[PDB]
Design a protein around this ligand. Structure first.
Ligand SMILES: CN[C@@H]1[C@@H](O)[C@@H](O[C@@H]2[C@@H](O)[C@H](O[C@H]3O[C@H]([C@@H](C)O)[C@@H](O)[C@H](O)[C@H]3N)[C@@H](N)C[C@H]2N)OC[C@]1(C)O
Ligand SMILES: CN[C@@H]1[C@@H](O)[C@@H](O[C@@H]2[C@@H](O)[C@H](O[C@H]3O[C@H]([C@@H](C)O)[C@@H](O)[C@H](O)[C@H]3N)[C@@H](N)C[C@H]2N)OC[C@]1(C)O
Lengths: 386, 131, 62
RNA sequence: AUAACUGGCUUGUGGCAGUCAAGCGUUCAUAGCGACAUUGCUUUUUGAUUCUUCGAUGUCGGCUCUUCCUAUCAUACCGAAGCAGAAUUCGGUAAGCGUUGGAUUGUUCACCCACUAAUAGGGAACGUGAGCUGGGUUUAGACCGUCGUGAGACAGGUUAGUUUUACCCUACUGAUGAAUGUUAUCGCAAUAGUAAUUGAACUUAGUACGAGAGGAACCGUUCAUUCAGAUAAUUGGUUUUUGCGGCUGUCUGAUCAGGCAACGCCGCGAAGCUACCAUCUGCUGGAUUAUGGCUGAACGCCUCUAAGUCAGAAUCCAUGCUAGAACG
RNA sequence: UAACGAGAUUCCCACUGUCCCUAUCUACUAUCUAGCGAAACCACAGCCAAGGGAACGGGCUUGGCAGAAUCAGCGGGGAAAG
RNA sequence: AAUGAACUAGCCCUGAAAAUGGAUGGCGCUCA
RNA sequence: AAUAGGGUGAAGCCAGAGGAAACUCUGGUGGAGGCUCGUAGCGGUUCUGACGUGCAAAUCGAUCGUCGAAUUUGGGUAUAGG
């Protein structure tokens, strides 16, 4: 018989299976479509999620009730030191899809990226790329022949780049290595741009500007094994239910005589790969700027970090990206930032934001001061101050 | 007429709020909320500025035993405005109105939430302090 | 944006922090945290709570 | 060998659809209806039967949850009108997406109140009891009425009446993993899945249309509903941080400092977790259906159709998103 | 018919996680280990769709398909067991 | 330089709506 | 043989007040009752809680009825299968 009353399905059938992600680094499934007539540029950048804060802004949306009025908004800080380009990969079109033709590497690789090729670095002889380095030392002619191959045959060119994880407070010493696609120009221009950046640093401000709408790819917070009530949001059974109530009462009809894939079941929750789009860039701060957290209206000589540090992360001492709202992942998680895959002309996409104030009170409790100086001014001298 | 942002709901069906005008009613019992769609087992619930369908449980006899519109003017469930302020009043209260949003009484006791007065000009006319 | 003052403790209230209470007599009270709001609702006298600004001024401290 | 469920045949009865056209419809059979007759379809009604099960297939309803059908209530686009407008009615492609909160009743059913875009109808062993519940039915107690000489009877009423087991196989949900010279890093993408939804206000505009009364829409703007995926700034909830403070009784002679009250009690309480109780985010190309067209014969005329061809739906395939074949 | 009632019933006040709509915390389990170590049940067994068939198949016919060894859960099926 | 009416009966189209995905046995087949 | 601690406050008795009388009123005292709140005890309402191959062929937790008598209970003794 039919359901007595109608209700929408619990959970989405498009995020299946609800399993653990295959890798902790989130991969870019698709890159922005290439436009030959643009300047040669990177399409993505890797950073580390540091924490969240609060900002104040004036809204510019005519017709809104909050137009020309202050709004308070959550925002996320991504620690983004510059990346180092260490290689290049060429891809050829085939009737079976993109196939990588060859990979060319820079002459010198820093210890933090070479740690990525090891499970037991302290017990190894550190031989990675040691014979490859001699392909440059003689006359580099083999390297140039490989790059000529990429120019002749590739249709898609991506650069190999790694984070400088030792500029973050993370105790992990392995750097994160990723392929970032080069868009714009001819294939030959792409290879030349990759070559001139071998061993060089590329900064966030060259990929992402301020007011841009960008996407974040990351693995979500893990929760382990979870029951259906919280994993899928199903209704709790009545209090007097024998053998428990955090369940789905009927997991299927008699026929088909099999449990259907569409039925909510207990299993692993969180730690999923997600691609979230349309997060506005509120700031591209600079690590050398000693007033990262200051605005035009709030002139206090202040960094983006909250008093006491970001909880369970540390201090953000590099370039950073302040993003509107929340993004997938937890503190310390490597996040991949990607350019938008489409052109957006709506007000929210084209609005220019001007920050009034950024919060820097402690995230470790009910912080009521923005600065040590303000704390001292409010409380006066203390016993430990003599 | 107007477009108020989503507010934390305070008064589900069955809630009894104070009646704040001088119509002679003392209570207002919520039995429906205008604009409530469909969702199995979810109670209709109102926030400040919402029109409800109400009866008068305690008040003048000629007002009782009848279904009438009413508008919520304040609530004690905290809600967050777009400026980041979480605020809340001491009690939940409403006023008896017309289907067109026009009050039945002529005076309002106590403060009126800014969202309600922005949405309802006739209540704003009879209001004193607006927060 | 303007900084507000806790009605109970005197601590500074930055945008978004704390709660706003409107008493039935239309008077507005601001609290920076749930501690001061809880102490207010318990009907504690802020002049008898040692860490408040009212206490410290009433006892001539600082 | 034989009744009381499901299932099977049947389809009278129930339900749905056609054909004809006497009449209704100010004139006019067919805009919309449609008598007397007559052809079917369905298996969501109830029977008829007795094929299966009596070394037992758990026998109402509700709750929960998934999926399917279309005979479409709403939402998309359209054709018709006894379509001026507004509203409404008839019809097509359409099941992509939704279809609610309550009073009485054990109820399915019924019936009101109310919200809503709408409150369509059905299937899945009359889905669903090792998922629950147990109000009803249908053991034993007891009461009443009518019946019976009586023991007792009663699709008459009433009250009280134990709801057992999974650790196996498969399925499902997640989780490892041998073998592929070893080991490590970066990738591709077959196939499978897939997601958004509906409304209001402003503007158009007191405009088109209309004698008046009344009274739209496209582009656009701001919000919101239902849903989905995250996140923990903030606000709220939570406390074995037994972190700080307070309180009673008793014990360590007192003080200090502590023990116990089968976490003794109270206020606050970071961190972590978490809430439409909080915040953020939810993409754009191609091909079509209905339908309207172009050119154009058949058939010297005509005709959207026969050849060819244009536009065109909440449809479809992609883009995008999830997994990644553990023998690619 | 006062009083009485673990009797049946209706409404009101108070009260509340019964509910909207769920969240969080503790102990003991479950879990993993050392030692110890049962039972029910068992024709043979164990992936689906349709067909025909004792008219609802794990096996039969036609298709879909199909890769060792497995762990925690689970209550669709085994017209599961008793 | 052929055309007009009425009609007959072949194949084809309409009439022709159900619930897990699925059955001319399957693949597929169109001067078959 | 056994049965905490409270509440209520029956007759009888003392004192005072009113009244022409008949009688009546007030304060104490007293300690009645198959009376009452509530332990031990005896019982067994509800969760239709746990358990339901149990600790157990009837148990366990909370909740609950009664608790000075038609009360509870040891031992002895009698009644024996239509
Ligand atoms: C949750 N409240 C609902 C209340 O909304 C209402 O529901 C009706 C429902 O009974 C009606 O449905 C009813 O009537 C239809 C008939 C009209 O076609 C029957 O086919 C159907 O079997 C019957 N349930 C349905 N068509 C509208 C709902 N709002 O009445 C039933 C109810 C349970 O009280
Ligand atoms: C109404 N007639 C009954 C008749 O039915 C019969 O009664 C028997 C009774 O005798 C049986 O009992 C017999 O057997 C049992 C036991 C050994 O089983 C004995 O305890 C008993 O003494 C013996 N008489 C009893 N078990 C069943 C009745 N129907 O015996 C005669 C009669 C008592 O008059």
């Amino acid at each position: 018989s039919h359901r007595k009353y109608e209700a929408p399905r619990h959970g989405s059938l498009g995020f299946l299976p609800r399993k653990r992600a295959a890798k902790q680094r989130g991969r870019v499934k698709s890159f922005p479509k290439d436009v030959k007539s643009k300047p040669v540029a990177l399409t993505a950048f890797l950073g580390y999620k540091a924490g969240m804060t609060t900002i104040v802004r004036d809204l510019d949306r005519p017709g809104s009730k909050m137009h020309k009025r202050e709004v308070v908004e959550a925002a996320t800080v991504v620690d983004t030191p510059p990346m180092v380009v260490v290689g290049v990969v060429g891809y050829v079109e085939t009737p079976r899809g993109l196939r990588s033709l060859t990979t060319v590497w820079a002459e010198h690789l820093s210890e933090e990226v070479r740690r990525r090729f090891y499970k037991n670095w302290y017990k190894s002889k550190k031989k990675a790329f040691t014979k490859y380095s001699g392909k440059y030392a003689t006359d580099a002619k083999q390297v140039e022949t490989e790059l000529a191959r990429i120019k002749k045959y590739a249709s898609v060119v991506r650069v190999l780049a790694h984070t400088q994880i030792k500029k973050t407070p993370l105790s992990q010493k392995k750097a994160h290595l990723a392929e970032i696609q080069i868009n714009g120009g001819s294939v030959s221009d792409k290879v030349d741009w990759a070559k001139e950046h071998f061993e060089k640093e590329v900064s966030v401000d060259s990929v992402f500007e301020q007011d841009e709408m960008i996407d974040v790819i990351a693995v979500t917070k893990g929760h382990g094994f979870e029951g259906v009530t919280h994993r899928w949001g199903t209704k709790k059974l009545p209090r007097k239910t024998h053998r428990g109530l955090r369940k789905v009462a009927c997991i299927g009809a008699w026929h088909p005589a099999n449990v259907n894939w569409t039925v909510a079941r207990a299993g692993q929750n969180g730690y999923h790969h997600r691609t979230s789009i349309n997060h506005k860039v509120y700031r591209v701060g600079k690590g050398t700027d000693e007033a990262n957290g200051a605005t035009e209206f709030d002139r206090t000589k202040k960094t983006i970090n909250p008093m006491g540090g970001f909880v369970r992360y540390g201090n953000v001492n590099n370039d950073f990206v302040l993003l509107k709202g929340s993004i997938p992942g937890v503190k310390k998680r490597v996040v991949t930032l990607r350019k938008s895959l489409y052109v957006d002309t709506s007000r929210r996409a084209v609005e220019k934001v001007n920050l009034k104030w950024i919060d820097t009170a402690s995230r470790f409790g009910k912080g009521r001061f923005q600065t040590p100086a303000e704390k001292h001014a409010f409380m006066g001298t203390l016993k430990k101050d003599l | 007429s107007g477009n108020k942002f989503r507010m934390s709901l305070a008064l589900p069906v069955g809630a009894v709020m104070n009646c704040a005008d001088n119509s002679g009613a003392r209570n207002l019992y919520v039995l429906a909320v205008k604009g409530t769609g469909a969702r199995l087992n979810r109670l209709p619930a109102a926030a400040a500025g919402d029109m409800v369908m109400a009866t008068v449980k305690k008040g003048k006899p000629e007002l009782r035993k009848k279904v009438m519109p009413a508008i919520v003017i304040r609530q004690s469930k905290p809600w967050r405005r777009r400026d980041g302020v979480y605020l809340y009043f001491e009690d939940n209260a409403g006023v008896i109105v017309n289907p067109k949003g026009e009050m039945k009484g002529s005076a309002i006791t106590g403060p009126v939430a800014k969202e309600c007065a922005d949405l309802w000009p006739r209540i704003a006319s009879n209001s004193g302090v607006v927060v | 944006m303007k900084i507000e003052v806790d009605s109970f403790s005197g601590s500074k209230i930055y945008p978004g922090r704390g709660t706003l209470f409107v008493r039935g007599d239309s008077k507005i009270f601001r609290f920076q945290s749930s501690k001061s709001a809880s102490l207010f609702q318990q009907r504690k006298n802020p002049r008898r709570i040692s860490w408040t600004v009212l206490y410290r001024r009433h006892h001539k401290k600082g």
